[PDB]
Amino acid sequence: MVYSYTEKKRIRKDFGKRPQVLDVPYLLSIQLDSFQKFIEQDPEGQYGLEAAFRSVFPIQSYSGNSELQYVSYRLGEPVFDVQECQIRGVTYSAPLRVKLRLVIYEREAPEGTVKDIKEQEVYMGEIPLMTDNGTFVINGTERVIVSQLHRSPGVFFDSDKGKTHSSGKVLYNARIIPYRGSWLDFEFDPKDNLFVRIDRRRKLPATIILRALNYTTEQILDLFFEKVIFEIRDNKLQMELVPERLRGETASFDIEANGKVYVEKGRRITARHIRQLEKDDVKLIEVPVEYIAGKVVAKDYIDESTGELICAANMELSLDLLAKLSQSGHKRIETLFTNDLDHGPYISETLRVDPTNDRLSALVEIYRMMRPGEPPTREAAESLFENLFFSEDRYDLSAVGRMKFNRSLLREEIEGSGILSKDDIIDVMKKLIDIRNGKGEVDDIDHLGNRRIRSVGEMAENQFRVGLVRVERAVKERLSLGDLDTLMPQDMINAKPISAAVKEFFGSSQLSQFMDQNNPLSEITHKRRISALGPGGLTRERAGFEVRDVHPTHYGRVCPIETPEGPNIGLINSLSVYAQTNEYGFLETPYRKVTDGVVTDEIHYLSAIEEGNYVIAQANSNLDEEGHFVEDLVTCRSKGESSLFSRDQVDYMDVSTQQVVSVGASLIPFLEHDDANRALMGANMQRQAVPTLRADKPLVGTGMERAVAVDSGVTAVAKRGGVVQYVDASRIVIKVNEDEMYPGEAGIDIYNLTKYTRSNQNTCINQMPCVSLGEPVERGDVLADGPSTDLGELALGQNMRVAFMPWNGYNFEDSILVSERVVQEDRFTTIHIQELACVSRDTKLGPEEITADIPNVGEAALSKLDESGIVYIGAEVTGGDILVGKVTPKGETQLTPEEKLLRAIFGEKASDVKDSSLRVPNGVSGTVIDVQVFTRDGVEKDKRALEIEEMQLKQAKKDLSEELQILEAGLFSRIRAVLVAGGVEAEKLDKLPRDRWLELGLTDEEKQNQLEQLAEQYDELKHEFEKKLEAKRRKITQGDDLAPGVLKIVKVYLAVKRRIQPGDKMAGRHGNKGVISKINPIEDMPYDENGTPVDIVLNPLGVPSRMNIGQILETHLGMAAKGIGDKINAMLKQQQEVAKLREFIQRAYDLGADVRQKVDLSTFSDEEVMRLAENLRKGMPIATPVFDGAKEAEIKELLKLGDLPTSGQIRLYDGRTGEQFERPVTVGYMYMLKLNHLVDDKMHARSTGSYSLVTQQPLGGKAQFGGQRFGEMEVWALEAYGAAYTLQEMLTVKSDDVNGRTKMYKNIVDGNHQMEPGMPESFNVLLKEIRSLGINIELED
């Protein structure tokens, strides 16, 4: 039982078989949750401004014993509202002020503070504030900041091998990416040598980075390699061999073991021999001397007597050296293992490549890399190396970086430091060597467990931190210099740097762009957009071919459908419906827990990494009553390879079928019957729809339109409402009932609708009320309908009656034939609004004025101008009429008798002014909606600028006096009630207030005090009303501050109604678009047996080649819905009794498989059925979920209820000949929408206009009547044709041949048609530009 009083007007039938478990989320959380936590006062400093301050705020003088701290920051209250900011043109922001503390301490005392200056806070910049819709109002225009998707800081063991190696060998490098600082890369060479690289610059040998960290050869060897004892005493030459530790090598000769020999000479090593050698205890066994020559020594050995450098570290043993080292040095020599099969040194080969053996020579190598010249002096190189990586305030990567680092190295601990560590470096190199030898797997960059998203709040925090670190330097300098002062804490705290940084980020940035404003869907999908480009990630749309593919981990996190089809395909994505952000920034998605067969209601959010372990079932899986599975074998996903599993192996199940698609692609009915390409194109073309005059709901939907319309913030929803008092075309007031009311307020909620305001796309934004007087309204119910919304549903388009048949070739390839009735009924008619502005721009000759005293103009031109010089509101203006009469002063009139005579005769002109008026651009026509004038402070011309001022003041007075009137009425009722039974009737109070006769009863009881208190309260209420009115008036008439040159600004808005015509581009929701080719009269259009003509004829030759069965299914379902609506309309027209209508509606609502229980006659009264039927008389609304839609059998059944042919076809007749078409045709109702590509804005023509000063060519792409561009391919075409004369003509006469253009024009006007080619001007420009270099060039004869 769903009441939903706003929805009970029109209930949309659902074909959803599956039961919904989790409700759709807020749909705009990603944009505003981050910003909310960015400016939230956190008791612990983790994120936001509290974390940005604690980073680098404590300022310590250069041994000046004077510090600077802060107590807390407070966010100021915004100066203007969002609507005020938008009408003005200023930015919406809030001042920031933080209480600081400057402490000065005397010398000769350890931390002995003598004075504190913690008494004044300093304002440092303004933060642009976010509205209720996850959008900013920067500079008066709504802007949205897109989230970024980059690689999380950490360590990545990418392969980077294959064809790019150019040697047929695989490589294994490793990169450590920090959040801030320099990058460190550990490559490999085809010579099996590793090299360290910083900032992708010239490489270095392997162990220089080790030697820089005070590591010597002995520790490096003993740490990276394992050393065997090699105890060879008394020339025994015996080896401690462990078959379990090392094996797999065939024995050469002279190999023995305990008891029998381990392996015979020349015999292959066997697992049985290894097992025997492991079972029997094996002591030191003797081997031939050949094993010593190839082996290398681990440490440096020194003779007992003297300390020569014999047997140097990392040196192969020699036969001659062996005798002397055994005689003099020692008997047991440390050595290595160095087996190719399962190991590889890869470092000892590099140690000899190192030119530096001491830390002294090693440390300067990195300085040589970093800086070419200026060799260090034992204080620069060490400082640079310590500050590059191991400094706290220069690397400081992240918590996420440390978390990834520890997870990728099998470390339990997660809380680490932003500084790197030597041990971390050795672990990284060891794991690189391990993966080279074969110990694990290389990483995957495309995996969504390796990429995290950055929202607006955290990038704003980063920009603020960058801006603050700059002013920290100035504060420190001013504190160090001239510290002998007791001034207020404004020594160097300048708000301009921080404010400039934040304004630069918010206003002009790659991720900050104008919001789309032509659809609620367009807005709500621009706010959920995810881009890979920007300050980071992929620097350009190039350099990627597998980055832009659909990775298997994109299941419930990003949409595989919605993405542009241009150069940046795959680099722009959209979140799924349920996708949420992890704690650190990764993407999650909800699942239901499955316990021992049953499916619980509890929801667990799993990131990309977690979902790879468990076995997750499928949403299209049958379920029992208790939560058991019907079939023993169910389809699941285990590690990226879906297959069949039993009911005892599953661990999770998907929430709903809408989980893998975004909000854009979940509005397409029958999405599973459309190809991926066509679904992508339909989703992309849905956003371009431009709203029409009358909104029309879709007869075939998916149920997501209600949620999209509500969450888009484009309607006017009722908060804490109980009943409606007064309804108007532009105002709604709701009398909140006492249940949802708290004391201290009148109890009136007022909503001011938005009427005909320009959008970012020059479209129209209009809100229309839905409720009537005395209509009870609940909480969360809509009250107004924004652009393209119908009773709270997203309605972008109209239900056209289509027919699928060829028609004399007027729908040849992608063209559409439209009936004239469509144009007559004003479907697809659109309203467009433009903005024109003019400025005064005072001069040294004198200020410019708008006085309408314009010279050299006729009285007809100035007919539409007011006294001040600006157009009347509502006047119609076309072409080049005058909008604002502006004049620019000229120089002083000369004493010359000619000008003196002109002044004496005519006067009032004196050539003082010139006609620089604002005129409508050519080919622009419309009617003026409203003007807006802005005058700077100190200028009080205000010719007619007071009219809008008075209008705003009166509107404020009207909307402010209502609450005071309600409070006064309540107080008067209280007085009338407290004077009851006191000998005074209510007649006197109704006649005259008299303050209840000032307690004329004089009972001396509490009544006198009550009347005195009520009089005092009334006086206080009146004073509050006057104060509020004066404050509103002062905020209204205060005046604006403009640019220094600008004196005043006048803005004019024009509204244009654009209708449908051939050339305009229509579309559907299934990736089918087209251009109107003809508008056919109603007589010719094909008609059926009842005389009703179809509205649009479409070509059936796109369906089989584009796989768009969704179109056909949609038309069949729409035909069924319209049949039901027509039957209901007929029963209403017959004025039949309520019982039969109710029974028919119930039978039409209960049809189909088990989907949803809804019944009339138990919740709907006798009256609600009337309005429900009157709402759904133009068609039965139907909702089919995305992958859970209606079935063909159910569509055929529904067609039978409205008495229609179940096949979907119908016989049609030709309108011009009256002869029946054989092969009956398919008619239906498709939801067609009009796109933003109109032929009115496409046509452009030119014969001769204005050229550029340089190169003398026509301007360009309609930039003030520009020309069109012949190109290299077009000249190739002309040359292939052999069109020498046409080519020469296009080269010279139509272009920069200055002396030839005029001659050709003259000859054409005279009727000659002859050409004088001459020479182009661009070639002369090229010759001059070449001669501007020291290169002589000229033309000979």
Partner: peptide
């Protein structure tokens, strides 16, 4: 990009010469 190569304007003398040419 910085704005360059402005348009050419039609002054009185140029307009009168244009009309003389025809």
């Amino acid at each position: 990009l910085p704005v360059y190569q402005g348009e050419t304007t039609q002054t009185l003398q140029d307009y009168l010469m244009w009309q003389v040419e025809l």
